[PDB]
Amino acid sequence: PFSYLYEKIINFRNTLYDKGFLKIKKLPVPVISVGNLSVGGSGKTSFVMYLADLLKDKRVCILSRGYKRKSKGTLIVSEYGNLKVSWEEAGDEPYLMAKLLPHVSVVASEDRYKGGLLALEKLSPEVFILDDGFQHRKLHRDLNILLLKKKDLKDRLLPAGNLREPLKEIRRADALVLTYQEVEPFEFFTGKPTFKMFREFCCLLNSDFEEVPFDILKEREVIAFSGLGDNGQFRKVLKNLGIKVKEFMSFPDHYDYSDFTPEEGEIYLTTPKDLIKLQGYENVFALNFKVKLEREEKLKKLIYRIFY
Numbered sequence: 558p559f560s561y562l563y564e565k566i567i568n569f570r571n572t573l574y575d576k577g578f579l580k581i582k583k584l585p586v587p588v589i590s591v592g593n594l595s596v597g598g599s600g601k602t603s604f605v606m607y608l609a610d611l612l613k614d615k616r617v618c619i620l621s622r623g624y625k626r627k628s629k630g631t632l633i634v635s636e637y638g639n640l641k642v643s644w645e646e647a648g649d650e651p652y653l654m655a656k657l658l659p660h661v662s663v664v665a666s667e668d669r670y671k672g673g674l675l676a677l678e679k680l681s682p683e684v685f686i687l688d689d690g691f692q693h694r695k696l697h698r699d700l701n702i703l704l705l706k707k708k709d710l711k712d713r714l715l716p717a718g719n720l721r722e723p724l725k726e727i728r729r730a731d732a733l734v735l736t737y738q739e740v741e742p743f744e745f746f747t748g749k750p751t752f753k754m755f756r757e758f759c760c761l762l763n764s765d766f767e768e769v770p771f772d773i774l775k776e777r778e779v780i781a782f783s784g785l786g787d788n789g790q791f792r793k794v795l796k797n798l799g800i801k802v803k804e805f806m807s808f809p810d811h812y813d814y815s816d817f818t819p820e821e822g823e824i825y826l827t828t829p830k831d832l833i834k835l836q837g838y839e840n841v842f843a844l845n846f847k848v849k850l851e852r853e854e855k856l857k858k859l860i861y862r863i864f865y
């Protein structure tokens with residue numbers, strides 16, 4: 558215990574940034590930040606991929622921390638779709654983004670500015686997206702996008718609750734994205750430009766990352782599993798879709814699946830984040846989805862202003 562202190566620290570830190578007492582560094586191309594206020598997952602990766610698709614007319618580089626990765630330095634994970642490292646070296650989320658975005662570069666660094674300077678030197682990108690950037694104040698962003706989910710609104714600061722910062726810090730966002738609307742719909746009004754995000758669960762991937770039809774999940778009970786910030790929303794999605802799940806295994810976030818052995822005759826259903834670690838396993842599939850945003854044309858205008 559407790560708790561009261563973390564908040565002091567975070568508050569102190571934010572005030573220092575608020576008043577020009579800590580350095581904020583600036584990259585010489587536009588930078589969009591995507592981030593959120595809590596631990597446990599908010600659809601940031603998905604929103605990043607959506608953004609990357611909006612931005613397809615530009616050379617895009619994603620700057621990521623690469624959580625849990627086995628490497629140290631600033632690292633180029635992918636150049637314009639050429640994967641330079643294994644998923645274990647990249648961290649599962651940078652690798653997943655690189656893999657699903659064959660037109661985008663991905664760099665992992667603790668210090669995002671440093672990652673960006675390395676990318677500029679080697680990759681020449683026209684825009685950076687920070688994949689988890691909201692708390693990383695020391696890097697200037699031209700558009701600060703905050704993702705919020707319903708749960709956040711009644712949550713509290715770590716380590717009692719899941720908030721990384723108090724809710725008042727919503728003030729720092731240029732735009733809010735209200736996520737997980739297909740599972741926990743909600744409304745937030747703040748006066749800030751606000752966009753609801755929906756995941757449209759439409760697709761099945763085999764372990765070679767090829768689309769396959771659902772006919773396979775028919776009259777089969779599956780064993781489902783994931784290791785996620787929150788496995789609960791995945792198991793809720795499966796129920797809402799009416800997928801017949803006979804057993805659900807809830808693994809730790811970023812689980813490496815070293816212990817995993819499929820049982821003969823069974824069908825396994827999992828997420829793409831998990832499937833990157835199980836490539837080529839037969840009879841392991843992932844549920845995939847499209848990301849859809851309200852008022853996209855409004856969002857696009859907001860996004861393109863940064864280039865002017």
Ligand SMILES: Nc1ncnc2c1ncn2[C@@H]1O[C@H](COP(=O)(O)OP(=O)(O)CP(=O)(O)O)[C@@H](O)[C@H]1O
Pocket residue numbers: 597598599600601602603650653785786787790791794827828829830831844845846
């Ligand atoms: N309900 C679901 N169905 C299918 N895949 C899902 C899923 N929920 C999460 N995923 C997968 O896990 C990835 C992580 O998304 P998630 O919403 O869990 O956290 P995140 O993007 O906010 C990053 P972090 O957990 O590190 O904060 C997604 O891109 C997707 O591959």
